[PDB]
């Protein structure tokens, strides 16, 4: 039969607050990073541990920025995220002018 | 073979002191080594600023004390100052 929405998401929130393993798996992330660096310097190799470092820092970064964005939306008398929420959080932190 | 550094055995002994029945992972030992690195670096940078805002180039323990209670928050800092001061007394009282 059909389950009622919202439940499975929070249950897997309780599941995904447990294992600190990396969410984005390796190969596509590596290709994206390689396609990026190339724009700064051609023919550049990467130490795989450095790639794991980039992966870790990126994922924790985005998770924390999500936390602030989520609390913005909770303040915004809503439950669902919006892109304007990300703009608000970034405008508070000061990445963009 | 170039000889590399770690602080693993020292804090390893300290861990064995405070918890005899406790194991540890290797990566976490590296994390603690990086921890000591970071705290040491912030302290030393505050020491260099202590020098240049005091126009002096000698480093004594007094500067280390004022550096620690500049960086660390109060209660933790005062306990650490107590530990360091009692160690200063126990060492310099003897040779």
């Amino acid at each position: 039969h059909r389950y009622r929405p919202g439940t499975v998401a929070l249950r897997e929130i309780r599941r995904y607050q447990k294992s600190t393993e990396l969410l984005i798996r390796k190969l596509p992330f590596q290709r994206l990073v390689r396609e990026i660096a190339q724009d700064f310097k051609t023919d550049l190799r990467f130490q795989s541990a450095a790639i794991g470092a980039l992966q870790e820092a990126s994922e924790a970064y985005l998770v924390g920025l999500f936390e602030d964005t989520n609390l913005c939306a909770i303040h915004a008398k809503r439950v669902t995220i919006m892109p304007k929420d990300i703009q608000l959080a970034r405008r508070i932190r000061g990445e963009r002018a | 073979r170039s000889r590399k550094e770690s602080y693993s055995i020292y804090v390893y002994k300290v861990l064995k002191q405070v918890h005899p029945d406790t194991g540890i992972s290797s990566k976490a030992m590296g994390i603690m080594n990086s921890f000591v690195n970071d705290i040491f670096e912030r302290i030393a940078g505050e020491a260099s600023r202590l020098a240049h805002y005091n126009k002096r180039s000698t480093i004594t323990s007094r500067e280390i004390q004022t550096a620690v209670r500049l960086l660390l928050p109060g209660e933790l800092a005062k306990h650490a100052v107590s530990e360091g001061t009692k160690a200063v007394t126990k060492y310099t009282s003897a040779k």
């Binding site: 607050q17 984005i24 396609e35 660096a37 541990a49 820092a57 989520n70 892109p83 990300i86 | 970071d38």
Partner: protein, 78 residues
């Protein structure tokens, strides 16, 4: 390219963040901000390796570039 980021990946990012309900334009906005983040990071990382006169970016240089953006990360010898 940038479209190697899957939808359930950013969903899992919401889950470890603990976020419940998801809109639409979130995905492309996420990929954009992630891109600019990695742009600054890997730019000054390759700047470090440029000074290194060597053809592989060190993990050390990655760590120090994170320090240069005030994003100090332990764990990997820093």
């Amino acid at each position: 390219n940038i479209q190697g980021i899957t939808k359930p990946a950013i969903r899992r990012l919401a889950r470890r963040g603990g976020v419940k309900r998801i809109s639409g334009l979130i995905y492309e906005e996420t990929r954009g901000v992630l891109k600019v983040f990695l742009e600054n990071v890997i730019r000054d990382a390759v700047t470090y390796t440029e000074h290194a006169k060597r053809k592989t970016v060190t993990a050390m240089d990655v760590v120090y570039a994170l320090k240069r953006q005030g994003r100090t990360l332990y764990g990997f010898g820093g």
